[PDB]
Amino acid sequence: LSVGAAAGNATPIPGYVIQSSAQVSDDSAVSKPGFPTSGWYPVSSRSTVYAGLLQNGKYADPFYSTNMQNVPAAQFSVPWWYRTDLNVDDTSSRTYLDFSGVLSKADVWVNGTKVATKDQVNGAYTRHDLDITAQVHTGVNSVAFKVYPNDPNRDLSMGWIDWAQTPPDQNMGIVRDVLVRRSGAVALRSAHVIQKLNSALDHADLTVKADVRNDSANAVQTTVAGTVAGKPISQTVSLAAKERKTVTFPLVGLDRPNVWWPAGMGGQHRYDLDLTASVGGTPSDAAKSKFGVRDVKATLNSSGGRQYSVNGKPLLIRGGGYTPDLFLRWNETAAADKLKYVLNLGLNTVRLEGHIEPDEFFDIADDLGVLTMPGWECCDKWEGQVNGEEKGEPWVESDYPIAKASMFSEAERLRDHPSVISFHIGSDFAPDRRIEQGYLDAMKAADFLLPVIPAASARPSPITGASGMKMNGPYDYVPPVYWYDKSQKDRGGAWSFNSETSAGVDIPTMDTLKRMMSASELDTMWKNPSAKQYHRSSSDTFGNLKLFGDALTKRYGASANLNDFVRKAQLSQYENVRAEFESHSRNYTDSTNPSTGLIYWMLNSPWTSLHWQLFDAYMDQNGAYYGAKKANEPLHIQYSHDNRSVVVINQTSNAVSGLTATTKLYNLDGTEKYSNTKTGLSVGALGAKATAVTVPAVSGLSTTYLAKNVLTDSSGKEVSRNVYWLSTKADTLNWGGSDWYYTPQSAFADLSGLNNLGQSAVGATANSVAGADGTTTTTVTLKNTSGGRLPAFYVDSKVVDSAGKPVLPVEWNDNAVSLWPGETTTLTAKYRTADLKGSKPSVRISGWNTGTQTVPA
Ligand SMILES: N[C@@H]1[C@@H](O)[C@H](O)[C@@H](CO)O[C@H]1O
């Protein structure tokens, strides 16, 4: 590692060697140049200890079976060292270490001098700016962090709640970059742009702020100058030796600003701020950043629901709870791939319940137009002062400035990312008055001006007040009609802001299953859903798949083998996730107690999982993924499980007219039993709706039957197709048996007729184009080629290599399609040509009642 002396240099440390403090008897020795490190583990930047150990071989893949249980965790109850050399050719410039992401805390050492202790460098989110100029010399220098064990119940850090299983090291280590900064007499810090747009969105005012600190021995004059949004700015201030000042620039007007919008509502432009602090007509330090020109509000409606708006347009939040990797393994491409899946699902938002990602994650969210809802997490140290018998320790005096500093450092990091639409200062429990005041003060000090939400539950805080949100569950199996409930004011139906809910178990694709679980584990899964599954949750409540398995059997019919269990799981998950979203889209425009938000629990999993996910840890796409994608189409037709109304939803930024909605019921033998064609429908922009028809009680339906809903635009183009498998037997709730995480059923729909749906046929041609942008698009033309009346039902197309392995990540325009005899659809999948790994592409096509084939693409 070499760092130049250039003013404004800020170079990330690319890697470390690590070893347990068990092997280090003299702490001061480690950071002396020449300290031997034989047997130490080389690890990349942003590594937890265990991730470093995995990078070196040292344990088997924790994504497979119970491999993670075989790691001795005692070794992580003592500190580990992160060490690097640093070459400095020229000590003319001052030298700083600027970092955050230390879990839980650290002593910091340079060339045999302890520059900071774990009392100062404490908390995952706290930022540190350590001037190490006195310690640095020309040639080989050495830097070492003694990183202390992490306990999320004790430390203001990150924990995993009940999402997965506990990482053996509790994620101890350094999970963001440590920057080596160089600068002259004056350091430049905290440069940012306060931006205020008018209601017409055609003029903005910019107030640039930046701090300058004179770390030299003598008084200086400094000039802070550069550009904001293409316009020149310059201020000159005096600084005493050791003085820090905030420089405020005179207001800058910006006409016809290139306003940042959420995806689909306009562009995702960010402007640049570029500053240099100069001393004696020579640069001393420099900083470049971005900001977006966007207004956001989050207010309580007349029903008490939290209602977001961006640039004066109200939105229904449609999102998922986002999580990083279980061992905080960072990959910039992977972050991009995950946020891109958000938009392929048609979602608009992700929630981060703690685990707040490095800066690049928010850069990508900004660039893609994905809204973000960061905040502190429940159920550990963060809520320890207010959450009673729940996990997390009561706070002592030294906790208060760590929390406040954590808030200041996150507010400072997040304030100029336009994707950020709020910060949750509480999750579960709202903070008390003292803690809340600390957070509000930190945010004001950082000019963090975004909406503050006191909790994701219905709990108010003393100052900010009512949350406008609810956390009533469920987190486990409930039938599709559950989501249409508005009668139960303590449950999770479509009304108010649903900040975290799902129907629990989300079995991944067979391809993923075979990568995460052994033959014997998979066998238990379908034979005994009641058995604990390591790849569900460490929580007793969510340790097994019983509620899911019982419902699947009741409602699909008993599983005959593993393949049967999996195919049925995919329908149940598509059916459920679809209803969850669709109910919330429908009730968004209710006059009273509308739904104002939905955060699916969860978008994704920290690892290979059996629950709470839309896409799995390998980026594969199952029935839950496809069901969410179906429900969130920009021009969409849907069927209401409560009242049988056919409803059109327009997610787009423009009102649409001249639509026709066609609804047809079929028995499983293919007989049409009902048809309705509703022409001339209009529907307003940004989540508004129109009712096409209420399907009547039709006579002579098979016990399981099909509803085919089709929306066509005024040109005649089919813009949405949506096929439901329905029963003449209702799912109904035993509401009085409700617990915090689910409501049991008093009767079960009968969808078991699908077991005996006759065979149909498809019908497949595929071709691929490798583009100059490094992507390949594969186009597949599917046709129901059968000679009878039977639809080809639930046809899943997968891009695969020559070995039949899924090419991932992948983005389809549509998938999991249903085609009546003689009907054709053309589907389009896009992925990185490089992810084929030299293979020609093929397409695996599997339908519920059409078998499996692969065709060359
Ligand atoms: N905010 C938490 C989530 O993190 C958790 O997964 C869910 C299910 O236990 O409960 C909520 O209390």
Sign of CA dihedral 396, 402, 406, 412: positive
Pocket residues: Cβ below 6 A from ligand 1: 161-163, 353, 378, 427-428, 475, 500
Give yes or no: residues 395 and 520 share one domain. yes
Q: Give the distance from CA 704 to its chain's centroid.
A: 36
Give yes or no: residues 238 and 177 share one domain. no
Sign of CA dihedral 708, 713, 715, 718: negative
Helix (H) / strand (E) containing 223: strand 220-228
Q: Whose CA is nearest to atom 2 of ligand 1?
A: 378
- DSSP output for 121-137: SBSTT--EEEE-TTT--
Give yes or no: residues 597 and 615 share one domain. yes
Give yes or no: residues 70 and 148 share one domain. yes
CATH code: domain of residue 487? 3.20.20.80
Tell me the best of 379, 380, 429, 613 to mutate to test the pocket of ligand 1, counting ligand atoms within 8 Å of each CB and taking the most: 379
Give yes or no: residues 649 and 615 share one domain. no
**Which of 736, 756, 776 is the last residue before a domain boundary?**
756
The region that residue 264 occupies, defined by phi over 0 for left and psi between -120 and 50 for alpha, beta otherwise, is left
Tell me the best of 158, 160, 162, 457 to mutate to test the pocket of ligand 1, counting ligand atoms within 8 Å of each CB and taking the most: 162
Give yes or no: residues 169 and 191 share one domain. no
Count of structural domains, the chain = 5
- Closest ligand 1 atom to the C-alpha of 353? 4
CA distances from 750 to 56, 555, 576, 725 (A): 52, 5, 15, 10
Spacing, Cα 120 to ligand 1 middle (Å): 31
Spacing, Cα 307 to ligand 1 middle (Å): 22
Q: How was this structure determined?
A: X-ray
CA distances from 342 to 267, 338, 349, 617 (A): 17, 7, 8, 14
**Are residues 637 and 711 in contact, defined by beta-carbon separation less than 8 angstroms?**
yes
Give yes or no: residues 764 and 752 share one domain. no
Spacing, Cα 455 to ligand 1 middle (Å): 13
Catalytic positions: 428, 500
Neighbouring-strand partners of residue 285: 277
**Are residues 245 and 274 in contact, defined by beta-carbon separation less than 8 angstroms?**
no
CA distances from 239 to 216, 221, 233, 514, 836 (A): 10, 6, 19, 64, 58
Whole-number Å distance between alpha carbons of 819 and 631: 18
Give yes or no: residues 289 and 300 share one domain. no
546-556 and 562-587 helices, crossing angle to 10° = 90
Amino acid at 22: A
Three-class secondary structure assignment of 140-173: EEEEEEEECCCCCCCCCCCCCCCCCCCCCCCCCE
**Which of 184, 204, 227 is the last residue before a domain boundary?**
184
Give yes or no: residues 657 and 576 share one domain. no
Question: Is residue 408 helix, strand or coil?
Answer: helix
Whole-number Å distance between alpha carbons of 297 and 291: 18
Give yes or no: residues 200 and 345 share one domain. no
CATH code: domain of residue 811? 2.60.40.10
The region that residue 134 occupies, defined by phi over 0 for left and psi between -120 and 50 for alpha, beta otherwise, is alpha
Residue partners of 460: CB distance under 8 A and separation at least 6: 430, 454, 466, 467
Whole-number Å distance between alpha carbons of 461 and 357: 26
Spacing, Cα 751 to ligand 1 middle (Å): 31
Give yes or no: residues 48 and 175 share one domain. yes
Whole-number Å distance between alpha carbons of 633 and 639: 14
Helix (H) / strand (E) containing 582: helix 562-587
- Closest ligand 1 atom to the C-alpha of 541? 9
Spacing, Cα 556 to ligand 1 middle (Å): 29
**Are residues 327 and 76 in contact, defined by beta-carbon separation less than 8 angstroms?**
no
CATH code: domain of residue 62? 2.60.120.260
**Which of 184, 200, 234 is the last residue before a domain boundary?**
184
Give yes or no: residues 663 and 592 share one domain. no
- DSSP output for 470-494: E-----S---GGGGG--S-TTS-SS
Q: 826 is in which domain, residue-wise? A: 757-857
- Closest ligand 1 atom to the C-alpha of 741? 8
